[model samples]
Target: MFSKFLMNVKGVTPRGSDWANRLGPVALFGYGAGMPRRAPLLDFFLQSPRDCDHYAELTIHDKGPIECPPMFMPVLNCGQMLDEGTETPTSDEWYLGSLEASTELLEKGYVPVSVGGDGSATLSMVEAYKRLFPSDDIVIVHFDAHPSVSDPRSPLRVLLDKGLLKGVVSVGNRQVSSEDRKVRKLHKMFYMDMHAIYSKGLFCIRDIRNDYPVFISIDADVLDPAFAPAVDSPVAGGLSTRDLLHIMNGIRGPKVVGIDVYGYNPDLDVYRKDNVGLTAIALSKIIKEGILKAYSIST
Candidate 1:
């Protein structure tokens, strides 16, 4: 069965269970408490058993929102919402608590894979990694439909602006706004559109720097709207499920330290069985092949 080999060998924990005690190379978190105002990805986790499959265990915290200026806003081109102010809530309790949780996992030698309410959550995840490995240069491997570079706080943009990252490589982006283009040029970001990725195979990802530690952030909207319509900002011409899976499976080196899958709006998910199931399978494969196979870490 695909489930046996594809799924990582680990136990499953409920909402209030202690995930820090769970044993596995992967640590999973569902960060959607505020997503209810928009999508409520937590509901999907609660409703679909598939989301809990193959992860050593699941941890759901009753954390609140980050008390800071909104980094992402609903606007035209989606990039216009970018604010040049603060990148993220550096002092918010929820954000700080999230980082602490991730740091604990790192101390225990588990790869933290968080399911987020939105891409902004990645800011905290990256910050946590930086704190744990301050000496190691960081590179971001982002898979999303949008460049998410309207402002300095736009997760990836913030990483580049703050000089926190050595490089940024994006895959499955079909819509590139002028703001994103400017950021890409200034930051020297490597972008592999769907055409290049589909035609060039996974080798197109070679532009990514392999000397630094990697932090992967996946916005579910990277898939075509037809396949994953649950995203907050759905783009039409995106990568196929097979394409994303191949990319996940083919990624190598730099030893991915952490990863997050965000932007899955359960309210918009037309087919729970299809969309949720696909997400579950994709997450599992990333843990099994992407992390477990590529790195020599013990579970």
Candidate 2:
């Protein structure tokens, strides 16, 4: 069963695999590639089958003609780990399987929603989407702590250099780096830090380039440490949950081709592990709000 809250969102559902690929406009899967060196041991956080009965696949049944049935497949969210040759996903070779799975989903034409292990999961999902449709004009609606350009393992640099992305619109940024300044200048990027949100208002997201399709990428740390504490880097003074919702919904154009929500360590989400933690709820709403925009906005 999908989460009770998710079931109410609009036009998404979980069906058997036999009915999924044949119908839904969206294919939601967990990229489970915890290979980003930064979170190698933090795998399986968003594998839908195991971790996210709470994740929503969205819709607006009254107004739209598309049906977005998803959440089937053994690979639903526990994506392949690099350990394929050496270990069980009990988890590098980590993202190789993730990439392969994403490519397969693209071949089938469903906009893939990749839940995560790390940013490499975003790389694989978009990389495959770009390879399959090289001419598709696309940009990344990146929501994170800062540009993940400080390390070799960060895939944003790789994607930009490889032409996987045409541009990026980064939001809720903090904990930035000087190198990121140079990188932003060289590329077609639009950045709005938390101050931009406050000074300019949430509508500032309208400045996002709308000529192409977009993939929404969010890191857990974009929320304040007190809000979502399990992220790889919990920055202070981040946006509140409702603040993110308004930001996401404010974008006026571009088809939301897919989404990836990563960098959260569910294992550390509570005083003890099994309770449904605040981070998951926060991410669920974020994902829920993302689906709201993905469905209502047109290409």
Candidate 3:
């Protein structure tokens, strides 16, 4: 199923014997529907340093040639789809493509790191995991500035309706609408406000059920506007890059299926070059320290 996107180290030197034979940390970039019309942030990540000695790239709903780092295999332009019109954010092309990529990677025991067009893109990951592991109770660890219970369009609603989400543990949110709060309560989600995350530390989350298969979904807007202003909705009073890294470091023993990072806009970040660098580095750490760490312990 993943043959089209698979590749070998050809013109590059293998980092190690273990790295040579395995491709455990693959990346799927979803230039999916439901994002602000903006410059591509995908380029920033594609060009960033990939410490994964062996990795493949799946560029969905995006044009190539995507210039990736030396450690990565050649970019695979998996497929393209219709651009999301302003009226509707959901695109069947994006959703199904992302699900396929995520499902194939997980089936092969690779740590699938997903990038998305908007927070809504997370639905793809949720759908894939649910299909692959129907009986496993999937827990979501969501990081965002908003509660993301805005309307019927939200990923939270989709997962809840499908019974895919066993529980939600939210972090780094300061802006919670009254309606969103109502929706959150209805779902019985556990909320750890941004202030508490920074002050008391992520130890508050240690007691949550780490036994369930965890999906970590991050919205770049969760970072303070001062740090990650490239997102469509930049809210004040959010986690700093360092704060996020610390939280990522604390996620140790969970069975993490994959990570989906959403909502970074290179158009909004043009003036904030430093923030782009920060976002890139923070993402790298999440893969290295969080996702990789969990995979190593589980397997």
Best candidate per TM-score, number?
Answer: 2
Candidate 2 residue-wise lDDT, 61-155, digit = tens: 21222333434222223222232323334223445555666566556545567665676777877877777778897788888988876665587
Q: Positional deviation of 138 in candidate 2, in angstroms?
A: 1.6
lDDT of all predictions: 0.57, 0.61, 0.60
Best by lDDT: 2
The deviation in Å at residue 17 for candidate 1 is 25
Instruction: Give the Cα RMSD of candidate 3.
Output: 7.3
Question: How do all models score by TM-score?
Answer: 0.68, 0.73, 0.71
- Any idea what lDDT model 1 has? 0.57
- Indicate whether candidate 2 or candidate 3 has the larger TM-score: 2
| Candidate 1 clash figure, as a count | 2
- Model 3 agreement with the true structure over 133-220: per-residue lDDT tens digits: 7888888888888888777778877787666788887888898888888888888888788778768865564443456777788888
lDDT of 3 at 171: 84
Off by over 4 Å in 3: 1-27, 36-43, 50-90, 199-209, 270-290, 294-299
Candidate 1 segments exceeding 4 Å error:
1-24, 37-93, 199-209, 272-299
Candidate with better TM-score, 1 vs 2: 2
Off by over 4 Å in 2: 1-24, 35-92, 203-209, 271-274
lDDT of 3 at 253: 34
